[PDB]
């Protein structure tokens, strides 16, 4: 019953996938790993594979420090941007839940505006 709880931010952007594990108070972080720290290719930084590797590494580190259960708070880049988590976020979440940590109270904390300022692209959209 005396299992120490932390919280894990999962930042799922279209270029990187941040996995951050902190204690209950948002300060005093424990372990932060990005997608680029596990892959050296300059093209697989946003891939689900890099997110999975980062989640495994941060799971090993958080098991080492002492904590054994984390509440997951996942978010996209948000704002005027896409505001919906991408496949790197689900990959990191599945790899975190796979490695034996107790997972409870999964909640999306993406920043959603009350119809805020303009976005880049200028009337013809981001040409993609």
């Amino acid at each position: 019953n005396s299992q120490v709880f932390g919280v894990a931010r999962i930042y799922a952007s279209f270029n990187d996938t941040f996995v951050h594990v902190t204690d209950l108070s948002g300060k005093e972080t424990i372990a932060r790993v990005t997608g680029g720290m596990k892959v050296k290719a300059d093209r697989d930084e946003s891939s689900p594979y890099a997110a999975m590797l980062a989640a495994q590494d941060v799971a090993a580190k958080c098991k080492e420090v002492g904590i054994t259960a984390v509440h997951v708070k996942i978010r996209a880049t948000g704002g005027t941007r896409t505001k919906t988590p991408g496949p790197g976020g689900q990959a990191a979440l599945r790899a975190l839940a796979r490695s034996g940590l107790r997972i409870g109270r999964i909640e999306d904390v993406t920043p959603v505006p009350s119809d805020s300022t303009r976005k880049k692209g200028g009337r013809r959209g981001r040409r993609l």
């Binding site: 120490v4 108070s25 948002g26 005093e28 424990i30 999306d108």
Partner: protein, 216 residues
């Protein structure tokens, strides 16, 4: 090269006595060396925990409480109430097409010089025999409902300090009071107070905090 997590020590954070389970978790902090104590680096942290982990039941699964850390002694850091919010998923599920959203807020003060901003929410409904598909409401109805909700919220806040307000907000008796008052104007399903937050604080007054704590 230094392994900073070895010099750190863990402290035990415990909720105020108003909730059922008054032991909420653990936190870690650096060792109290010279010219930077471990006390003053801890006296302002705000945690956010779900209400169910405070109350056990699953009927309070959507709410969550922000608790500010106020005092510390002997690994025990003592907290107070700072705010309440719904989770985002419940807020997204409540908003539905073909019905009217109603929001209201007031800023008020308690018996002591706390300052609160409180946000209440409501939606319309159909009373089980309505063939009409939407059941919107006219603007005079929404204005009357905002006035009634604002007056109830103000009356139920200034009549007590923060302790009885939390003790009245945990079993959500204000929602049933609003449902009683506005049922003669329009149906109004799904009435909640979606958010409360502190704005300004008076002097610390450790006696009141230690009176709220100090049991068990």
């Amino acid at each position: 090269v230094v392994d900073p997590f070895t010099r750190k020590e863990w402290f035990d954070i415990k909720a105020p006595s108003t909730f059922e389970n008054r032991n909420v978790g653990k936190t870690l902090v650096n060792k109290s060396t010279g010219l930077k104590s471990a006390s003053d680096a801890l006296k302002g942290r705000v945690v956010e925990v779900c209400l169910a982990d405070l109350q056990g039941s699953e009927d309070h699964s959507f709410r969550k409480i922000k608790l500010r850390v106020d005092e510390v002694q002997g690994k025990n850091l003592l907290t107070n109430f700072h705010g309440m919010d719904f989770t985002t998923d419940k807020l997204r599920s409540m908003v539905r097409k073909w019905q009217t959203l109603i929001e209201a807020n007031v800023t008020v003060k308690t018996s002591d010089d706390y300052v609160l901003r409180i946000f209440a929410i409501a939606f319309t409904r159909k009373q089980a025999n309505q063939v009409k598909r939407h059941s919107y409401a006219q603007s005079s109805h929404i204005r009357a409902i905002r006035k009634v909700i604002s007056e109830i919220l103000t009356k139920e806040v200034q009549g007590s300090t923060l302790a009885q307000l939390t003790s009245k907000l945990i079993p959500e008796v204000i929602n049933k009071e609003i449902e009683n008052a506005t049922k003669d104007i329009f149906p109004l399903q799904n009435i909640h107070v979606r958010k409360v937050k502190l704005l300004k604080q008076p002097k610390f007054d450790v006696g009141a905090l230690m009176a709220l704590h100090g049991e068990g």
